[PDB]
Design a protein around this nucleic acid. Structure first.
Ligand code: DGT
Ligand code: CA
Ligand code: CA
Ligand code: CA
Length: 342
DNA sequence: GGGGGAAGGATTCC
DNA sequence: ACGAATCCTTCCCCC
């Protein structure tokens, strides 16, 4: 009887760019992450639907994008801006419920149980929220409504873009039998592939398997998550999430193993990681390396007290040395991550 | 046998 | 090809 309302902003980064420069609307827009290795080295962060019609979507190389749509509008990612627009929209949402879970820069779950009853009122509260967000910030979003967070999210995926949908108890039961298990949040290609070999292509299929076999192949946590959803029993509460890590990682002009060559990038990473820390003081620091073969290796250390920036600098070099020493590959990307805030 | 935690990697998804 | 959360496996120290 928990009634959950999930909000997911439409093609967010690109839409914010449109809002900030309305002449862009209707034109294919592609927000890019430029790495600096060469001409258009980098990847697409996201694109509006005009561009997605033709295959230009999040994750593909900018070069592949331009081959497909050479006359599209290509803009560099401005996350700070998108984050501030997001914050304002999240504030508007806090008005519809006091129980809100900001899941990311562009999604939030609202528990509107003691805010309205039955789904009709749920649906209407959705249009109000959509309209309110469209009128106030001029951003279109998709609303998903169901009994728990997972199905509210699924409802939204099904109604994208600029939609609103309700998945009532009856359809839930149908989806537990009908839904491709790969479409269940938290299930990626890796877990999807493991679930197939076990003969699980639908949530329901997880109940026809030996738990220890499931647990054995995908882990205890994931196993209980899926079984729980198949039993129409998943029911996680909507809570306030708090930042737990702040980091930065940059691509070097060229790959390397030379310490003095990597340092400047690593220190640049820490500088910006600290400015983002605000007043937050971390007890743990990790140096993260992305190797030439796009592998991710890391070495860290937790201290029994906070880490001053001079300490972070000194410790980061020691961890980068551990990496170079323990890993033979050249380093492509280097950065740092601070956590366990006092 | 287990609690309790740190450490490095795996997997997922804004 | 360009940030952050959770869980898993392995160690480790210890009662
Ligand atoms: N840098 C980078 N940013 C991403 C990536 N994927 C998503 N983002 C950022 C930008 C997206 O606009 C934002 C929201 O992600 P979504 O998966 O919901 O996609 P978007 O909202 O763009 O499209 P949508 O209408 O929800 O299908 O998160 C990525 O692969 N790299
Ligand atoms: Ca979205
Ligand atoms: Ca999203
Ligand atoms: Ca999937």
């Amino acid at each position: 009887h928990m009634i959950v309302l999930f909000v997911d902003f439409d093609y967010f980064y690109a839409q914010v760019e449109e809002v900030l420069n309305p002449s862009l609307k209707g034109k294919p827009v592609v927000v890019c992450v430029f790495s600096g290795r060469f001409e258009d080295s980098g990847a697409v962060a996201t694109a509006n639907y005009e561009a997605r019609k033709f295959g230009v979507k999040a994750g593909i190389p900018i070069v592949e994008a331009k081959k497909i749509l050479p006359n599209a509008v290509y803009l560099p990612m401005r996350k700070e801006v998108y984050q501030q627009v997001s914050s304002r929209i999240m504030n508007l949402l806090r008005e519809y419920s006091e129980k809100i879970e900001i899941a990311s820069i562009d999604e939030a779950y609202l528990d509107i149980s003691d805010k309205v009853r039955d789904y009709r009122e749920a649906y209407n509260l959705g249009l109000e929220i959509k309209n309110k967000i469209l009128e106030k910030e001029k951003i279109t979003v998709t609303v998903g409504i169901s009994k728990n967070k997972v199905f509210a999210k699924i409802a939204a995926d099904m109604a994208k873009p600029n939609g609103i949908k309700v998945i009532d108890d009856e359809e839930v039961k149908r989806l537990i039998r009908e839904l491709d298990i790969a479409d269940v949040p938290g299930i990626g290609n890796i877990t999807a592939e493991k679930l197939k070999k076990l003969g699980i292509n639908k949530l329901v299929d997880t109940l026809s398997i030996e738990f220890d076999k499931l647990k054995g192949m995908i882990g205890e946590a994931k196993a209980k998550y899926l079984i729980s959803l198949a039993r129409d029993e998943y029911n996680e509460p909507i809570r306030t999430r708090v930042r737990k890590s702040i980091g930065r990682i940059v691509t070097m002009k060229r790959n390397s193993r030379n310490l003095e060559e990597i340092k400047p990038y690593l220190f640049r990473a820490i500088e910006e990681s600290y400015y983002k820390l605000d007043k937050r003081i971390p007890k743990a620091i990790h140096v993260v390396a992305v190797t030439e073969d796009l592998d991710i290796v890391s070495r860290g250390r937790t201290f029994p007290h906070g880490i001053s920036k001079e300490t972070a600098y000194s410790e980061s070099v020691k961890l980068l040395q551990k990496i170079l020493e323990e890993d033979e590959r050249k380093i492509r990307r280097i950065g740092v991550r601070f956590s366990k805030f006092i």
